[PDB]
RNA sequence: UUGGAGAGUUUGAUCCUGGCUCAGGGUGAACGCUGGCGGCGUGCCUAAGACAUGCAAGUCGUGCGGGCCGCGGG
């Protein structure tokens, strides 16, 4: 089994008549430390169903992070719609250093130490997809010289 | 490559834009409450406004001629 965080749970409304009527979201990570990490955004009526649906999905959509010695290969900058996360490699005394969203996804991948930025529009479940994105065009010396 | 964390706040809820605001470090500081010691710093950013009193530039008789006192003695 892998290690599970709950990164966003939020409230929302609908509006009715007769007023509004709630639903919940949770975003929530998923992974080994060793490379493996997912991404789920689950909603339910109610708190505990978002969240356990949230693990669904986020095992279901996973990716392989390509750690070297706890860091990632290269520099890696993506934008999700107004979201933008900067990831830069980072030697051993470094540490993780990024905003709860990116840190808790990194963390869980297995990343001990990176340096990171989060630019534009910084909405959680919108950062929190840009840095999936991000780890999921990670390459290695060997892709690279495999690819040309 | 030794280096980069963000959060609150427009909505019934959403994403975006955008400003405001906060957490950090800094000071020749001041103000409140409080106040035991020591070291190293450091102390009129305002009126280059006005200043009592003392002191902050003198030395040389191995450049010269004297005044006064004094020591030796003609
Ligand atoms: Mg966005
Ligand atoms: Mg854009
Ligand atoms: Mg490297
Ligand atoms: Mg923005
Ligand atoms: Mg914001
Ligand atoms: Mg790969
Ligand atoms: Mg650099
Ligand atoms: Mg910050
Ligand atoms: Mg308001
Ligand atoms: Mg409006
Ligand atoms: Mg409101
Ligand atoms: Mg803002
Ligand atoms: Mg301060
Ligand atoms: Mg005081
Ligand atoms: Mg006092
Ligand atoms: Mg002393
Ligand atoms: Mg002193
Ligand atoms: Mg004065
Ligand atoms: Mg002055
Ligand atoms: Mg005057
Ligand atoms: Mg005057
Ligand atoms: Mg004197």
Redesign the pocket.
Same mark, same amino acid.
């Given at each position: 089994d892998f290690e599970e965080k709950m990164i966003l749970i #939020?409230r929302?409304? #609908?509006?009715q008549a007769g007023g #509004?009527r709630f639903r919940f979201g949770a975003l929530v990570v998923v992974g080994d430390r060793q490379g493996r990490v997912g991404l789920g955004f689950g909603k339910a009526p109610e708190v505990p169903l978002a969240v356990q649906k949230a693990g669904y999905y986020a095992r279901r959509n996973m990716v392989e992070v390509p750690l070297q010695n706890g860091t990632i290969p290269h520099?890696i900058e993506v934008e999700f719609?107004?979201?933008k996360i900067?990831l830069?490699?980072?030697?051993?005394?470094?540490g993780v250093?990024? @905003?709860?969203?990116?840190?808790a996804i990194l963390e869980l991948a297995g990343v001990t130490?990176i340096?990171?930025?989060?630019? @534009?529009? #910084? $909405?959680?479940? $919108?950062?929190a997809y840009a840095t999936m994105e991000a780890l999921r065009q990670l390459r290695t010396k060997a892709d690279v010289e495999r690819l040309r």
């Open positions: #939020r929302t409304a #609908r509006m #509004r520099e719609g107004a979201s900067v830069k490699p980072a030697a051993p005394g470094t250093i990024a @905003g709860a969203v990116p840190r130490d340096l990171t930025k989060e630019l @534009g529009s #910084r $909405n959680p479940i $919108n950062i």
